[PDB]
Enzyme design. Sequence first.
Site, PDB file in Angstrom:
ATOM      1  N   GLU A  14       0.837  -1.202   0.000  1.00  0.00           N
ATOM      2  CA  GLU A  14       0.000   0.000   0.000  1.00  0.00           C
ATOM      3  C   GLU A  14       0.870   1.251   0.000  1.00  0.00           C
ATOM      4  OE1 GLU A  14      -3.127   1.096  -0.315  1.00  0.00           O
ATOM      5  OE2 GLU A  14      -2.411   3.132   0.105  1.00  0.00           O
ATOM      6  N   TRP A  72     -17.954  10.816  -6.839  1.00  0.00           N
ATOM      7  CA  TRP A  72     -16.815  10.116  -6.273  1.00  0.00           C
ATOM      8  C   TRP A  72     -16.891   8.613  -6.524  1.00  0.00           C
ATOM      9  CZ3 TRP A  72     -18.872  12.942  -1.575  1.00  0.00           C
ATOM     10  CH2 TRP A  72     -18.326  14.228  -1.461  1.00  0.00           C
ATOM     11  N   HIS A  73     -17.882   8.139  -7.269  1.00  0.00           N
ATOM     12  CA  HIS A  73     -18.063   6.711  -7.512  1.00  0.00           C
ATOM     13  C   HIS A  73     -17.534   6.310  -8.880  1.00  0.00           C
ATOM     14  CE1 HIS A  73     -21.619   6.611  -4.415  1.00  0.00           C
ATOM     15  NE2 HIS A  73     -20.503   7.095  -3.905  1.00  0.00           N
ATOM     16  N   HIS A 107     -24.253   3.148  -4.149  1.00  0.00           N
ATOM     17  CA  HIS A 107     -23.117   3.340  -3.252  1.00  0.00           C
ATOM     18  C   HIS A 107     -22.332   2.038  -3.297  1.00  0.00           C
ATOM     19  CE1 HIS A 107     -25.744   6.607  -1.989  1.00  0.00           C
ATOM     20  NE2 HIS A 107     -24.647   7.203  -1.558  1.00  0.00           N
ATOM     21  N   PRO A 108     -21.228   2.005  -4.041  1.00  0.00           N
ATOM     22  CA  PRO A 108     -20.615   0.735  -4.439  1.00  0.00           C
ATOM     23  C   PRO A 108     -19.603   0.145  -3.471  1.00  0.00           C
ATOM     24  CG  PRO A 108     -19.511   2.541  -5.543  1.00  0.00           C
ATOM     25  CD  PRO A 108     -20.686   3.147  -4.800  1.00  0.00           C
ATOM     26  N   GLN A 109     -19.267   0.798  -2.353  1.00  0.00           N
ATOM     27  CA  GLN A 109     -18.226   0.232  -1.493  1.00  0.00           C
ATOM     28  C   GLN A 109     -18.611  -1.170  -1.029  1.00  0.00           C
ATOM     29  OE1 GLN A 109     -17.122   1.763   2.397  1.00  0.00           O
ATOM     30  NE2 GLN A 109     -19.229   2.238   3.054  1.00  0.00           N
ATOM     31  N   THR A 115     -10.317   3.821   0.003  1.00  0.00           N
ATOM     32  CA  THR A 115     -11.326   4.872   0.033  1.00  0.00           C
ATOM     33  C   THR A 115     -12.364   4.642   1.132  1.00  0.00           C
ATOM     34  OG1 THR A 115     -10.862   5.303  -2.281  1.00  0.00           O
ATOM     35  CG2 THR A 115     -12.990   6.116  -1.466  1.00  0.00           C
ATOM     36  N   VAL A 135       4.191   0.925  -5.551  1.00  0.00           N
ATOM     37  CA  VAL A 135       4.476  -0.092  -6.564  1.00  0.00           C
ATOM     38  C   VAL A 135       4.608   0.596  -7.918  1.00  0.00           C
ATOM     39  CG1 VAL A 135       3.720  -2.231  -7.665  1.00  0.00           C
ATOM     40  CG2 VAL A 135       3.252  -1.843  -5.239  1.00  0.00           C
ATOM     41  N   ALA A 167     -18.072   8.498   2.586  1.00  0.00           N
ATOM     42  CA  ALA A 167     -19.239   8.971   3.314  1.00  0.00           C
ATOM     43  C   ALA A 167     -19.962   7.859   4.072  1.00  0.00           C
ATOM     44  CB  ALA A 167     -20.206   9.678   2.349  1.00  0.00           C
ATOM     45  N   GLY A 168     -19.439   6.629   4.058  1.00  0.00           N
ATOM     46  CA  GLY A 168     -19.898   5.570   4.937  1.00  0.00           C
ATOM     47  C   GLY A 168     -21.136   4.809   4.495  1.00  0.00           C
TER      48      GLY A 168
HETATM   49  C1  LIG Z   1     -15.010  11.211  -0.978  1.00  0.00           C
HETATM   50  C2  LIG Z   1     -15.612   9.875  -1.340  1.00  0.00           C
HETATM   51  C3  LIG Z   1     -16.725   9.413  -0.641  1.00  0.00           C
HETATM   52  C4  LIG Z   1     -17.311   8.181  -0.957  1.00  0.00           C
HETATM   53  N1  LIG Z   1     -18.407   7.758  -0.226  1.00  0.00           N
HETATM   54  C5  LIG Z   1     -18.921   6.583  -0.510  1.00  0.00           C
HETATM   55  C6  LIG Z   1     -20.048   6.127   0.277  1.00  0.00           C
HETATM   56  O1  LIG Z   1     -20.562   6.747   1.208  1.00  0.00           O
HETATM   57  N2  LIG Z   1     -20.530   4.884  -0.092  1.00  0.00           N
HETATM   58  C7  LIG Z   1     -20.041   4.090  -1.124  1.00  0.00           C
HETATM   59  O2  LIG Z   1     -20.580   2.997  -1.342  1.00  0.00           O
HETATM   60  N3  LIG Z   1     -18.989   4.528  -1.869  1.00  0.00           N
HETATM   61  C8  LIG Z   1     -18.448   5.715  -1.555  1.00  0.00           C
HETATM   62  N4  LIG Z   1     -17.375   6.165  -2.289  1.00  0.00           N
HETATM   63  C9  LIG Z   1     -16.866   5.322  -3.378  1.00  0.00           C
HETATM   64  C10 LIG Z   1     -16.163   4.070  -2.887  1.00  0.00           C
HETATM   65  O3  LIG Z   1     -15.604   4.348  -1.601  1.00  0.00           O
HETATM   66  C11 LIG Z   1     -15.101   3.675  -3.914  1.00  0.00           C
HETATM   67  O4  LIG Z   1     -15.702   3.543  -5.199  1.00  0.00           O
HETATM   68  C12 LIG Z   1     -14.366   2.379  -3.583  1.00  0.00           C
HETATM   69  O5  LIG Z   1     -13.937   2.480  -2.226  1.00  0.00           O
HETATM   70  C13 LIG Z   1     -13.188   2.154  -4.508  1.00  0.00           C
HETATM   71  O6  LIG Z   1     -12.500   0.944  -4.117  1.00  0.00           O
HETATM   72  P1  LIG Z   1     -11.175   0.486  -4.846  1.00  0.00           P
HETATM   73  O7  LIG Z   1     -10.688  -0.793  -4.160  1.00  0.00           O
HETATM   74  O8  LIG Z   1     -11.431   0.432  -6.304  1.00  0.00           O
HETATM   75  O9  LIG Z   1     -10.155   1.668  -4.543  1.00  0.00           O
HETATM   76  P2  LIG Z   1      -9.416   2.189  -3.244  1.00  0.00           P
HETATM   77  O10 LIG Z   1     -10.296   1.875  -2.017  1.00  0.00           O
HETATM   78  O11 LIG Z   1      -9.092   3.635  -3.414  1.00  0.00           O
HETATM   79  O12 LIG Z   1      -8.121   1.305  -3.129  1.00  0.00           O
HETATM   80  C14 LIG Z   1      -6.964   1.543  -3.961  1.00  0.00           C
HETATM   81  C15 LIG Z   1      -5.746   1.579  -3.060  1.00  0.00           C
HETATM   82  O13 LIG Z   1      -4.551   1.388  -3.856  1.00  0.00           O
HETATM   83  C16 LIG Z   1      -3.544   2.255  -3.384  1.00  0.00           C
HETATM   84  N5  LIG Z   1      -2.607   2.435  -4.487  1.00  0.00           N
HETATM   85  C17 LIG Z   1      -2.851   3.046  -5.691  1.00  0.00           C
HETATM   86  N6  LIG Z   1      -1.848   2.980  -6.536  1.00  0.00           N
HETATM   87  C18 LIG Z   1      -0.881   2.265  -5.842  1.00  0.00           C
HETATM   88  C19 LIG Z   1       0.426   1.863  -6.180  1.00  0.00           C
HETATM   89  N7  LIG Z   1       1.004   2.132  -7.354  1.00  0.00           N
HETATM   90  N8  LIG Z   1       1.126   1.161  -5.253  1.00  0.00           N
HETATM   91  C20 LIG Z   1       0.550   0.890  -4.081  1.00  0.00           C
HETATM   92  N9  LIG Z   1      -0.673   1.220  -3.652  1.00  0.00           N
HETATM   93  C21 LIG Z   1      -1.341   1.911  -4.584  1.00  0.00           C
HETATM   94  C22 LIG Z   1      -4.293   3.503  -2.919  1.00  0.00           C
HETATM   95  O14 LIG Z   1      -3.558   4.265  -1.969  1.00  0.00           O
HETATM   96  C23 LIG Z   1      -5.552   2.886  -2.287  1.00  0.00           C
HETATM   97  O15 LIG Z   1      -5.425   2.626  -0.889  1.00  0.00           O
HETATM   98  C24 LIG Z   1     -16.760   7.402  -1.988  1.00  0.00           C
HETATM   99  C25 LIG Z   1     -15.653   7.867  -2.688  1.00  0.00           C
HETATM  100  C26 LIG Z   1     -15.065   9.091  -2.368  1.00  0.00           C
HETATM  101  C27 LIG Z   1     -13.872   9.568  -3.161  1.00  0.00           C
HETATM  102  N1  LIG Z   2     -20.945   9.045  -1.740  1.00  0.00           N
HETATM  103  C1  LIG Z   2     -21.810   9.483  -1.153  1.00  0.00           C
HETATM  104  C2  LIG Z   2     -22.994  10.109  -0.418  1.00  0.00           C
HETATM  105  O1  LIG Z   2     -24.145   9.862  -1.168  1.00  0.00           O
HETATM  106  C3  LIG Z   2     -22.751  11.608  -0.373  1.00  0.00           C
HETATM  107  C4  LIG Z   2     -22.140  12.178   0.736  1.00  0.00           C
HETATM  108  C5  LIG Z   2     -21.915  13.547   0.765  1.00  0.00           C
HETATM  109  C6  LIG Z   2     -22.292  14.332  -0.314  1.00  0.00           C
HETATM  110  C7  LIG Z   2     -22.896  13.755  -1.423  1.00  0.00           C
HETATM  111  C8  LIG Z   2     -23.128  12.392  -1.455  1.00  0.00           C
END
Ligand SMILES: Cc1cc2nc3c(=O)[nH]c(=O)nc-3n(C[C@H](O)[C@H](O)[C@H](O)COP(=O)(O)OP(=O)(O)OC[C@H]3O[C@@H](n4cnc5c(N)ncnc54)[C@H](O)[C@@H]3O)c2cc1C
Ligand SMILES: N#C[C@H](O)c1ccccc1
Length: 516
Positions: free
Chosen positions: A58, A456-457, A495-497, A109, A220, A114-115
């Site tokens: 990471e 942010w999704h 909300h894809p987390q 993320t 990486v 936003a949980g």
């Molecule tokens: C502000 C915000 C709020 C959100 N709120 C919500 C919500 O309320 N509900 C919801 O369902 N979704 C929410 N989302 C979206 C959701 O959280 C994301 O779509 C999801 O977490 C993405 O997962 P991932 O595994 O693809 O990426 P990530 O969780 O970002 O994981 C990628 C990881 O790889 C690491 N990394 C990258 N490049 C490298 C490298 N070269 N070497 C080593 N490590 C590296 C990064 O540091 C990171 O930790 C939100 C997104 C944002 C930005």
């Molecule tokens: N991701 C996500 C939530 O829906 C969200 C949280 C704050 C503002 C807009 C939307």
Amino acid sequence: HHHLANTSAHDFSYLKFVYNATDTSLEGSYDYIVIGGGTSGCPLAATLSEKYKVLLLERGTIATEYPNTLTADGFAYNLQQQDDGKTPVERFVSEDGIDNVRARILGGTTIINAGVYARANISFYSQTGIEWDLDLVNKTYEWVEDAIVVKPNNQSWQSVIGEGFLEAGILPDNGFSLDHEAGTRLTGSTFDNNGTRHAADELLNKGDPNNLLVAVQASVEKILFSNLSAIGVIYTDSDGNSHQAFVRGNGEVIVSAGTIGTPQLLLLSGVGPESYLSSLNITVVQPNPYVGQFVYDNPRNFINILPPNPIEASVVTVLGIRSDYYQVSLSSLPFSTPPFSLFPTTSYPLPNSTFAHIVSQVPGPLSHGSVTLNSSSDVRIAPNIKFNYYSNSTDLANCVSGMKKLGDLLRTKALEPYKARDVLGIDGFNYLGVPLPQTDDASFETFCLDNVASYWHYHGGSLVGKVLDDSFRVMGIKALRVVDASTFPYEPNSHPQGFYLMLGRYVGLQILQERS
Ligand SMILES: Cc1cc2nc3c(=O)[nH]c(=O)nc-3n(C[C@H](O)[C@H](O)[C@H](O)COP(=O)(O)OP(=O)(O)OC[C@H]3O[C@@H](n4cnc5c(N)ncnc54)[C@H](O)[C@@H]3O)c2cc1C
Ligand SMILES: N#C[C@H](O)c1ccccc1
Ligand SMILES: *[C@@H]1O[C@H](CO)[C@@H](O)[C@H](O)[C@H]1NC(C)=O
Ligand SMILES: *[C@@H]1O[C@H](CO)[C@@H](O)[C@H](O)[C@H]1NC(C)=O
Ligand SMILES: *[C@@H]1O[C@H](CO)[C@@H](O)[C@H](O)[C@H]1NC(C)=O
Ligand SMILES: *[C@@H]1O[C@H](CO)[C@@H](O)[C@H](O)[C@H]1NC(C)=O
Ligand SMILES: *[C@@H]1O[C@H](CO)[C@@H](O)[C@H](O)[C@H]1NC(C)=O
Ligand SMILES: *[C@@H]1O[C@H](CO)[C@@H](O)[C@H](O)[C@H]1NC(C)=O
């Protein structure tokens, strides 16, 4: 239900096997290397470690270094904090001109978001055409939910918004449900009832501490290749020194670096479009025209109301779902430093009192863009990203429908107590920023185009069916997979987390089953 997590402190027990990437004794051979300790990467690495030796790499540090990532109250703080290259929020601006962020921290993320927790729309699986083990999918959702998901307690503003959604016709009333279904519901949250954030890093506690090693501040830089096979990685530590780690036997490298980080690393490693990589004098290992292509960002559109009496700040828990728009509202204290990317530009009016951010999300979306390299050698240099918001007219049409529904919401008896003036129309609200327009479609189209922000999704860039097969293997390369949000071209839900947390473990189980 029954199985959901309880209120509890954030569990950092896994730090017993987290090491600084400066430690050269981490270099060597593993059964699996997982790149990116984020939403998918952490449960993937934990799952693989039940039977095999796993190295999780990471680039960010551990969340204890940034305590405001660990509470609901700290959500805005992490976005307000300036990006110094080490903070858990990395700032970026798409080529469209829309401010945005991605995570840089162990937990990914889920540590800054936003949980909101939801399971995928149950129609998603058949839409993909992947042969999902649906019973296992559901067992895996329960594994995640038992660890980090709670039923939220009542919050006054969320309850107002839920009554408004229902009064505005977003039916039926689904009560409390984790499922992405049409209607209004209370969904799950990864903030617990004491406001403590729970996140993907806590799923590392389900790994086998004798088999799982985690290196933090491990950037990486390159996937190493041999029958073309991935064999390892080069990563650099916080001092700048380089390190190498390898997989052995029937093991595999999995890229979980996110929508932005996975295509970047593939391109830097010579996996990508032949003429593009040749144009940069990057040696092509595996030509594929689609790496960094089909990158999506669902639009967020919104209004902000300033009630004449204070409202209580809340985390989003109440969702209004239709097939063509997904709606929520956040209530927030005022601020004099803007949380970066909450509004699409830094030059947005600042609220002087509590406000409600009332939001609609376009599904899909159908518009897409790409990720391209900004540096052909340095992974710490962020890539260029463009989403082409509203280039597809279906997206614009769907935003128009969502904005009209937001108009309906503002006209409900539920929202009436929050008007500044007791007049018949919605101009009785006081607005921060641009109010809703006028009745005809052209004004709503203009509003949608001019005031779009990122939800942010974002997702895509290494799609199943373009870069990957239905087992998430990079086509043409042995021992290389991708598991994160780069893999699908449409959302699984609003909300894809929840889906990507599940996906990390599920693909881990598929890998282990394949092994056996
Ligand atoms: C502000 C915000 C709020 C959100 N709120 C919500 C919500 O309320 N509900 C919801 O369902 N979704 C929410 N989302 C979206 C959701 O959280 C994301 O779509 C999801 O977490 C993405 O997962 P991932 O595994 O693809 O990426 P990530 O969780 O970002 O994981 C990628 C990881 O790889 C690491 N990394 C990258 N490049 C490298 C490298 N070269 N070497 C080593 N490590 C590296 C990064 O540091 C990171 O930790 C939100 C997104 C944002 C930005
Ligand atoms: N991701 C996500 C939530 O829906 C969200 C949280 C704050 C503002 C807009 C939307
Ligand atoms: C790793 O070690 C370096 C010193 O060699 C230090 O500056 C850095 O903060 C350390 N990182 C972590 C995550 O402990
Ligand atoms: C999986 O769970 C969903 C609820 O989230 C349910 O509707 C569905 O029937 C379940 N599928 C299987 C195969 O058990
Ligand atoms: C690639 O290398 C060739 C020399 O082999 C050079 O002519 C060309 O300008 C280089 N292009 C880039 C983008 O570095
Ligand atoms: C669920 O997904 C299906 C298939 O893609 C879609 O037709 C439907 O509109 C979605 N439902 C909701 C409520 O988003
Ligand atoms: C890299 O990003 C910068 C933004 O600072 C931009 O000005 C420049 O055009 C980009 N260069 C390439 C090669 O993408
Ligand atoms: C939008 O996307 C659809 C499906 O991907 C496609 O058929 C269409 O050509 C795109 N453009 C417009 C303007 O609809």
